[PDB]
Design a protein around this ligand. Structure first.
Ligand SMILES: *[C@@H]1O[C@H](CO)[C@@H](O[C@@H]2O[C@H](CO)[C@@H](O[C@@H]3O[C@H](CO[C@H]4O[C@H](CO)[C@@H](O)[C@H](O)[C@@H]4O)[C@@H](O)[C@H](O)[C@@H]3O)[C@H](O)[C@H]2NC(C)=O)[C@H](O)[C@H]1NC(C)=O
Ligand SMILES: *[C@@H]1O[C@H](CO)[C@@H](O[C@@H]2O[C@H](CO)[C@@H](O[C@@H]3O[C@H](CO)[C@@H](O)[C@H](O)[C@@H]3O)[C@H](O)[C@H]2NC(C)=O)[C@H](O)[C@H]1NC(C)=O
Lengths: 34, 48, 81
């Protein structure tokens, strides 16, 4: 393509994926504590 | 436009307007938002 | 249109329909009732603006899947630590 430009493209699933990662079971909150 | 093909089918006028706006490739959300403005403009044009 | 969480959902195509008991969406030119869900409809604005809107839950296909994965992971790694 000619004249294409730059900008990040948001993933609507990304925030939910991040929340799942954060509050999945106890990973990253209490699993890593020990 | 239903009755044109045959049996007439009752529908809300607002629903018909939304379908027309879709026909001209326009989203019905704006129509619902501005129902008052569209109606006022229509009536004013009728009077004019 | 419909309100699920204070937001207005509208049919991508077809029309909403309810003979009381339940609400569905179907193609305009044939009676093909279908469960209203995220993919069927789309969001625009909030509830107050529109006239004549009503209420109903909108089901999400993704939620039960991630809930199954939750059943697998959340409540299996419980007491080993
Ligand atoms: C007009 O009223 C009809 C009455 O049946 C509607 O039938 C639809 O049929 C499906 C299932 O075939 C319903 O979904 C489930 O239906 C089962 C059993 O079906 C019927 O019986 C239950 C009560 O035992 C009733 O609640 C259902 O609605 C059906 O009447 C249920 O056990 C489930 O809980 C679930 O309802 C649809 O819910 C049902 N739709 C409606 C609005 O009742 C038909 O859809 C109606 N037509 C339109 C355009 O809305
Ligand atoms: C669909 O859900 C909404 C949100 O629940 C319903 O709104 C209802 O509207 C009335 C009037 O606002 C609420 O009654 C009272 O309103 C005053 C002023 O906002 C508020 O201070 C009171 O606490 C009280 O809410 C009503 O609570 C509210 N909820 C219900 C269940 O009626 C709407 O009526 C529901 N049905 C539709 C859109 O068909």
């Amino acid at each position: 393509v000619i004249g294409i430009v730059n900008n990040t493209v948001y993933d609507p699933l990304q925030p939910e994926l991040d929340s799942f990662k954060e509050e999945l079971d106890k990973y990253f909150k209490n699993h890593t504590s020990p | 436009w239903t009755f044109g093909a045959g049996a007439a089918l009752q529908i809300p006028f607002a629903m018909q307007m939304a379908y027309r706006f879709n026909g001209i490739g326009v989203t019905q959300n704006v129509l619902y938002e501005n129902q008052k403005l569209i109606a006022n403009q229509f009536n004013s044009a009728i009077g004019k | 249109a419909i309100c699920h969480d204070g937001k207005a959902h509208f049919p991508r195509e077809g029309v909403f329909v309810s003979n009381g008991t339940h609400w569905f969406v179907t193609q305009r030119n044939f009676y093909e009732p279908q469960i209203i869900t995220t993919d069927n409809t789309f969001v625009s604005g909030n509830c107050d603006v529109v006239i004549g809107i009503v209420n109903n839950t909108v089901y999400d296909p993704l939620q039960p899947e991630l809930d199954s994965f939750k059943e697998e992971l959340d409540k299996y790694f419980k007491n080993h630590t």
